[PDB]
Every structure is written in structure tokens, then in C-alpha cells.
Design a protein around this ligand. Structure first.
Ligand SMILES: Nc1ncnc2c1ncn2[C@@H]1O[C@H](COP(=O)(O)OP(=O)(O)NP(=O)(O)O)[C@@H](O)[C@H]1O
Ligand SMILES: Nc1ncnc2c1ncn2[C@@H]1O[C@H](COP(=O)(O)OP(=O)(O)NP(=O)(O)O)[C@@H](O)[C@H]1O
Lengths: 71, 92, 199, 49, 228
RNA sequence: CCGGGUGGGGGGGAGGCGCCGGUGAAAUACCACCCUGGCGCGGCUGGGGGCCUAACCCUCGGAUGGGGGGACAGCGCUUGGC
RNA sequence: UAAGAGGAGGUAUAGGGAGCGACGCUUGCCCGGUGCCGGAAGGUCAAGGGGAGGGGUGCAAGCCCCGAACCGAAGCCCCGGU
């Protein structure tokens, strides 16, 4: 795997399908779509000190790795 | 033709002038004494009135508002400046 | 700009044809809506309903702002105050009720129109029969007092000086667009150049 | 159905209607007649819709 | 500049910065209003209402059992035995339909009117054109029309007053002298609070009991809060 | 909207108006909570414009040295239109 | 499939796409429609920012759902070009 994280692991996927909106007022909404898709996380690149690595995902910067550079 | 049966009370409200204007254009006359023709007539009816009043047989007068029938139909503009000074004219 | 009225589902059939079409109307404060056009739209009939001249027996109107009124066909009964307040430099003063005829009482039937937090004006013709001095004595002071309106008239002399946006109904159309140049934006008849590039 | 209408008359005291036809042009004056509802009195209804 | 007034040493003492109480500023106004002849205190309040809406236009009174003196000039509208009760009780101006006809003629000397219900149809029809919305008019549940007119005047010498909020909500209560005791007229202003909140209508939004101030009518005085 | 009010600095060497008098629909001072009012104070802004550099982008015969770019762009979820 | 590779270790007298096909004489008239480019200023329209007012229960403070005055792009309409 090379879209996992170092403190977590996330490669998910979905399907998608679109129709109408008018539902409490009118007939019902149409449904003519079904297409499989994919829904990626965020890439990051970082450097702190003697310059290693890490690729965390956009909300575990302020939560995750500042403890491990607080040792 | 739809609405030829209505009372006076519940009428156009402002169309009275249009109905009264046609009443005097029937009947055999020589001099007309009109006070504000074009009271509630908006623009399209006041365009209808301004095309006849320079094409008339006898003489007419009109004692009305300024600026749209004056210097287009008017020929002598009498004016009462002070108390009782009706001699004062405008426009020839 | 809080609301006043939320009139909905208004329709009238006096002469067979529809006076008013199905709507859901709305007026709030800080507004100066003018009205225009037509010869038999009953814009004054319509005006009657907002004040409370009639009932419709179908509508579920609500109102909490109190209004004024100016009629279109009539005079008015006696309001004679001792040691007179703001009519000595305003239009006509105390006069007998036998001479009042013409552009003498239009300033008197609006002389009751300036009182008591009146929060809006429902006019139907302000400037009947009154000439140039009564114009500048109206428009100089009609713009004074704040609040929502709905003044309706027949020529854009003072209607360009005071109005921010203008309505026009053509069998109940509640189109709304910005005032002064309403006889200049009605060249959407020119986008009916189709029929001459489509046939 | 150009000039004819589907009108639906209600009471001078109460609820729902009694479903008839009208012309809208040669009469105009908001018709009214007399009928027997399900409260048994033979009252007069009015053109309400 | 700095114009200079006799009220300069007065408002070195009443510095308008803190929210003064009844009792602290009451003893302060005891020593403060110590110019020429005795102060006549009338605590006003300006209520945060829409007074042109008559569902929230409120007035009333409460009966305050204390000794008092020169304040509200009250027309008693009454007939014979109620008139004798009022004249024993200490009425400023007594009367009935005759004095109704007198104020209809030309004579004004009163601030409040109380009326006995035997002639109240005449006081409600006849007195409207001159009394009006001035602070003077009859009201049925505002301590104005009622059979206890003797109790109204008998207490006036100790307590009674009567509300009316004028244009923006301005309402009065006689609650003091140039140094009157505090407890007493403190009881006066506490039951003023109780009666105001008793005839408090539903239309409260925000600070209903909005603003509180002893302006009196015309002369020397500075304001008061009735909370403490 | 004539007069004048509103606000400061004066030329210094018992003083003026306010009381009284006056006048009439009110009468002279002056403290007035909170409301209408137009200028200011601590500031305040959806949006628009400047340069700076400890995010990152691209390149420098040994490259946290140096010199650029600059919070653009690139990238992730998401609305509308070809 | 994100990295990467051909363009090219080339830099507008170079590189992609479309059409007529040496040489000689020449390639006229239309911008109404369609496509492409340049648009001052304005007309409609999406999520999002907002909270006027109204609805359900509860001893009450409160907790739940609609909501719309105004502000918010590309594309279209309108005005000129080829
Ligand atoms: N009560 C009524 N009875 C009969 N017809 C009516 C009534 N009210 C309105 N109408 C009709 O509806 C139309 C509009 O009425 P009206 O109120 O006069 O329009 P308006 O907007 O006032 N225009 P104007 O007449 O020029 O002031 C008229 O042409 C009438 O024929
Ligand atoms: N019954 C009457 N008694 C006395 N004077 C009268 C009477 N009727 C009319 N007048 C006079 O006529 C005048 C009224 O105006 P009028 O003579 O109608 O001119 P007008 O231009 O029609 N008025 P307007 O159009 O309202 O500006 C007054 O100045 C009176 O002196």
C-alpha cells in the first residue's frame, strides 16, 4: 500500500447516482445514474528537524505528529 | 362588447373623462369649455386627445395644466398675474 | 427591513375577466414601489384591498402595520383646529366648505395624510389639479417622512425623483425592476426579433 | 371549457360543496340557490371555490 | 467655557457614573435637596413599550399607607355621601357633573381624576374631548373608576398616586420630601414596583422596565433606580 | 430662515443677565433615564489594492549554502455550465 | 495509476494541427444565421453567508423543523470584430 498513512490507513471508495430534488411537492425524483467512483485522502509532505518524512493527512498535523516532536 | 352593462358607481373610476369627452364630441356645438381634459388619461389616451384638438371646425378653449398641451395646441395663453390683471398674455 | 403583509392567492372577477391574478405578495420597510400602466387593471381596487375597503372571503391575509389612505373621488369633512398648526405654510388653511372645489381640496384630502406614525402611504393620485407650487410643496415634504409606500401616478416627473423601483401589472404580472427607466427597459419586444429569424 | 367553468358551491353556515357548472359570461352575478345538505334543513348555498 | 453653576457642587456629589440605589441616593438626596423650601419627589419611569398599541398602554395605582402632603390634584367625581367621604378624607377638588361642566367650560387645576360609578357613563361620554390622552382620562381598571373613592382620598394623605405613561413611556409616583423618612416612601416606591409589575402586560421583549429616573416636573432633582 | 445660537482664546481690574418688571396659547436659569437628530472617539467591516518572509514549486561540477518564484500555482472533498 | 517519458539535450528564420499540391496570369460580392476572438457597464440564474416571521411538546428557562430582505462566479442574453 502506498496511499496509507503512517499513523492511520485510509484508501476508500464509493458509487454515485443523481436525480431530482422535488419530493414533498411533486411526483418523486428521477434516478437514472449509477457510476462507481473513488474518494481519496490528502497528500502531505513535511520536514521538521534533521529532515525525514511522514505524509500525514491534513488534520493529524496539529493533532498527530507534534507530540512525536515533543518526543 | 363584453361589458356594455355596468353602473356609474362601479366604473373605470378614472375613465369617466374618456366617456364624457366623447359625449360632447357628439351633439352640435360651436364653443367648448373644457377644464383639464387629460385628468386621469395616462399617455396613450392623452396621445389620442392631442391629435384632434388642432383639427377642429369652430373654436375651443381649455383651462388646464401646462407643458404638454401648451405650445402644441395653444394659440393664445391668457394669464391672471395679480388680482384682476387678466390682460396679460403669452405666446403671440 | 421587517415585513408588513404577506398577501397570497388574490383574485377578482368583476367584469368576467380577471382583475387580479394569483399571487403571493410581499411588502417590507424601506421601500418606495411605484405602479404604472394599464387602463383597467384596478390598481386602485387592488389598493383598496390592502387598506381594508373590502373582503375576499378566500384570503388569509395578515397585517400589523397601520396605513394611511388617499381616495380618488371625493372630498372630506371638517378638521378645524384652534390656533392653527401645520396648514398655514402647508397648502390651504381654514376655509368655508362651499368654495372647496378643484385643486383646493386635493391638498386638503392629503392634509389628513400626515399624522401618527403612519408607517406607509397608500395613494392613488397625489397631484390631482394642483400646479407648480403644490408640486414643490408635496415632493419637498413627501420625501421627508420615512417608511414604506406604494404611490401610483401617471407621469415620470416626480415619479423619477422619489421612486427606487417600479412595478407594472398586465393582468396580474408582478414583475419588478428598477425605477425611472421603465419606458426604456420595455424593449424586450426587440428580443421578439424571433418570428423574423425563426420563420 | 373555454368559457364554461367547474364551480363547486358551499354553504352560508358550514363545510364542503355540491359540484356544478357555470357560464361566466352571459351571467356574471355570483349565483345562489337552495339545497338539502347532510344537516337536513334545505338551506341556500353560494358559489364558493 | 466651563460655564459655572450652583449645580456644580451638586454634581460633584451626584457624579453620574455609578448605578445609584434607592436608599444610598435617598439619604444623599435628603442632604442634596437642601436649598430653598422642601423638595417634592415624583419618581418617574420610562417603560420600554409601544404605547400607541393600546394592548400595552398601561396605567394603574396602589394604595400606600403613609403620611404625605402637597401633590396630585385629584378631581373627585362623586354624589352626596361619597362627596362627604371625600371632604372628610381631604380632597383637593371635589365634585361631580357640576365640576364636569366646569372643566367643560374653562377651569383646569387637576392632574388625576377619580370617579364614582354612579355617573361614570357621563364621565366617559362628556369628558373625552378635553381630557383625551393627556394624563387625565378615565380608565376602568387603572384605579380611576371605583366605589372606593373615599379610600382613594383618605389614603392620598399617605399614599395613592396613579400611573400614566406619556409619549415614550413616562410615568410618575410621589415618593418624597426634602428629607422624608426612607422606610415609608421606600414602601411607596416598592409597592410602585409591585403595582407596575402587577399590571405588566404580555408585550415584554428585552428590557421591559426600561429606564428609571426621578425627573420631577420643573426645578431641582437627580435620578433614582428602584431595584435596590 | 434676517436676527442669531453653538463652541474656544482674549483685551484684565464689582460685574452682567437670570430674580423682580414685562408679555401673553406657554416665560427666561438650569439637572434630566431613555428615544428622533449630525458631526467624533476605541475601533468596526462582504469586497478591492501594496510590498516582506521561518509553508511549498523549479534550478545552482562537493548542495538547509546561495538565488529565484510566492502564500499563485499544484493537490483533496464539493456546487453549477460545456 | 500520481512518479515519469517522446517534444529536445531543440528555443520562434524552431515546434505541433488544417487545407490546396511544380511553373506562368489571377484569386470578385455578402458579416442575416453557425463557429472563434475582444467587451466597457448592465438582465436572469448554484452551493455558501444570513436571520425577518410562523410550527410541535414541556411547570417554566430551553431543545427540535421550515424559512428568506440583502451580498455571492464561469456559461447564456445584449453590444462590435473575422
Ligand atoms: N366594483 C367593480 N365593478 C365592476 N367592474 C370593476 C369593479 N372594480 C374593477 N372593475 C373592472 O376592473 C378594471 C380595473 O378597475 P380600476 O380600479 O378602475 O382599475 P385602475 O387600476 O384603477 N385604472 P383607472 O381606472 O385608470 O384608475 C376596470 O376596467 C373595471 O371595469
Ligand atoms: N360658494 C362660493 N363662495 C365664495 N367664493 C367662491 C365660492 N365658490 C368658489 N368661490 C371662489 O372661487 C375660488 C375657488 O377656486 P376656483 O375659482 O374653482 O379656481 P380653480 O382653479 O378651479 N381652483 P383649483 O383648481 O382647486 O386650484 C375661491 O378663491 C373662491 O373665492
Amino acid at each position: 500500500m502506498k496511499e496509507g498513512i503512517h499513523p492511520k490507513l485510509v484508501p476508500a471508495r464509493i458509487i454515485c447516482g443523481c436525480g431530482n430534488v422535488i419530493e414533498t411537492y411533486s411526483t418523486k425524483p428521477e434516478i437514472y445514474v449509477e457510476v462507481c467512483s473513488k474518494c481519496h485522502p490528502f497528500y502531505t509532505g513535511q520536514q521538521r528537524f534533521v529532515d525525514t518524512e511522514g505524509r500525514v493527512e491534513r488534520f493529524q498535523r496539529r493533532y498527530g505528529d507534534s507530540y512525536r516532536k515533543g518526543r | 362588447a363584453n361589458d356594455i352593462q355596468k353602473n356609474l358607481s362601479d366604473l373605470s373610476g378614472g375613465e369617466i373623462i374618456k366617456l364624457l369627452l366623447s359625449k360632447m364630441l357628439l351633439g352640435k356645438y360651436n364653443i367648448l369649455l373644457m377644464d383639464e381634459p387629460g385628468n386621469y388619461l395616462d399617455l396613450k389616451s392623452i396621445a389620442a386627445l392631442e391629435t384632434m384638438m388642432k383639427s377642429y371646425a369652430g373654436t375651443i378653449i381649455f383651462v388646464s395644466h401646462d407643458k404638454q398641451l401648451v405650445d402644441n395646441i395653444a394659440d393664445i395663453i391668457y394669464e391672471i398675474k395679480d388680482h384682476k390683471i387678466i390682460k396679460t398674455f403669452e405666446r403671440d | 427591513m421587517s415585513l408588513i403583509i404577506k398577501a397570497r392567492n388574490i383574485r377578482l372577477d368583476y367584469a368576467g375577466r380577471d382583475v387580479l391574478d394569483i399571487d403571493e405578495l410581499e411588502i417590507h420597510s424601506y421601500d418606495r414601489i411605484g405602479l404604472v400602466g394599464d387602463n383597467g387593471a384596478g390598481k386602485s381596487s387592488l389598493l383598496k384591498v390592502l387598506n381594508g375597503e373590502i373582503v375576499l372571503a378566500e384570503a388569509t391575509l395578515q397585517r400589523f402595520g397601520d396605513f394611511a389612505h388617499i381616495s380618488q373621488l371625493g372630498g372630506i369633512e371638517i378638521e378645524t383646529v384652534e390656533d392653527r398648526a401645520m396648514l398655514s405654510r402647508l397648502g390651504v388653511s381654514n376655509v368655508q366648505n362651499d368654495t372647496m372645489s378643484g385643486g383646493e381640496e386635493t391638498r386638503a384630502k392629503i392634509a389628513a395624510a400626515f399624522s401618527q406614525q403612519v408607517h406607509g402611504i397608500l395613494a392613488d393620485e397625489p397631484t390631482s389639479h394642483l400646479d407648480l407650487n403644490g408640486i414643490d410643496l408635496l415632493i419637498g415634504q413627501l420625501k421627508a417622512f420615512d417608511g414604506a409606500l406604494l404611490v401610483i401616478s401617471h407621469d415620470r416627473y416626480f415619479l423619477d425623483m422619489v421612486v427606487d423601483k417600479i412595478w407594472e401589472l398586465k393582468d396580474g404580472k408582478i414583475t419588478e425592476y428598477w425605477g425611472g427607466y421603465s419606458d426604456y427597459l420595455r424593449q424586450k419586444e426587440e428580443e421578439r426579433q424571433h418570428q423574423a429569424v425563426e420563420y | 371549457v373555454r368559457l364554461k367553468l367547474l364551480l363547486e358551491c358551499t354553504e352560508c353556515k358550514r363545510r364542503n360543496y355540491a359540484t356544478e357548472k357555470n357560464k361566466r359570461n352571459t351571467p356574471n352575478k355570483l349565483e345562489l340557490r337552495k339545497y338539502c345538505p347532510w344537516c337536513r334543513k334545505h338551506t341556500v348555498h353560494r358559489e364558493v371555490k | 467655557p466651563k460655564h459655572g453653576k450652583r449645580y456644580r457642587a451638586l454634581l460633584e456629589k451626584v457624579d453620574p457614573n455609578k448605578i445609584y440605589t434607592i436608599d444610598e441616593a435617598a439619604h444623599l438626596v435628603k442632604e442634596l435637596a437642601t436649598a430653598k423650601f422642601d423638595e417634592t419627589v415624583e419618581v418617574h419611569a420610562k417603560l420600554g413599550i409601544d404605547p400607541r398599541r393600546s394592548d400595552q398602554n398601561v396605567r394603574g395605582t396602589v394604595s400606600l399607607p403613609h403620611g404625605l402632603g402637597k401633590q396630585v390634584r385629584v378631581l373627585a367625581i362623586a354624589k352626596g355621601e361619597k362627596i362627604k367621604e371625600a371632604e372628610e378624607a381631604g380632597a383637593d377638588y371635589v365634585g361631580g357633573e357640576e365640576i364636569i361642566q366646569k372643566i367643560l367650560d374653562g377651569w383646569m387645576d387637576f392632574d388625576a381624576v377619580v370617579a364614582t360609578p354612579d355617573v361614570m357613563g357621563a364621565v366617559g361620554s362628556k369628558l373625552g374631548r378635553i381630557l383625551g390622552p393627556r394624563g387625565l382620562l378615565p380608565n376602568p381598571k387603572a384605579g380611576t373608576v371605583g366605589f372606593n373613592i373615599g379610600e382613594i382620598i383618605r389614603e392620598i394623605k399617605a399614599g395613592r398616586i396613579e400611573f400614566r405613561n406619556d409619549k415614550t413611556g413616562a410615568i410618575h409616583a410621589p415618593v418624597g420630601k426634602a428629607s422624608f423618612p426612607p422606610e415609608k416612601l421606600a414602601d411607596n416606591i416598592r409597592a410602585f414596583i409591585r403595582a407596575l409589575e402587577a399590571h405588566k402586560p404580555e408585550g415584554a421583549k428585552g428590557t421591559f422596565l426600561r429606564s428609571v429616573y426621578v425627573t420631577t416636573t420643573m426645578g431641582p432633582s437627580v435620578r433614582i433606580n428602584p431595584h435596590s
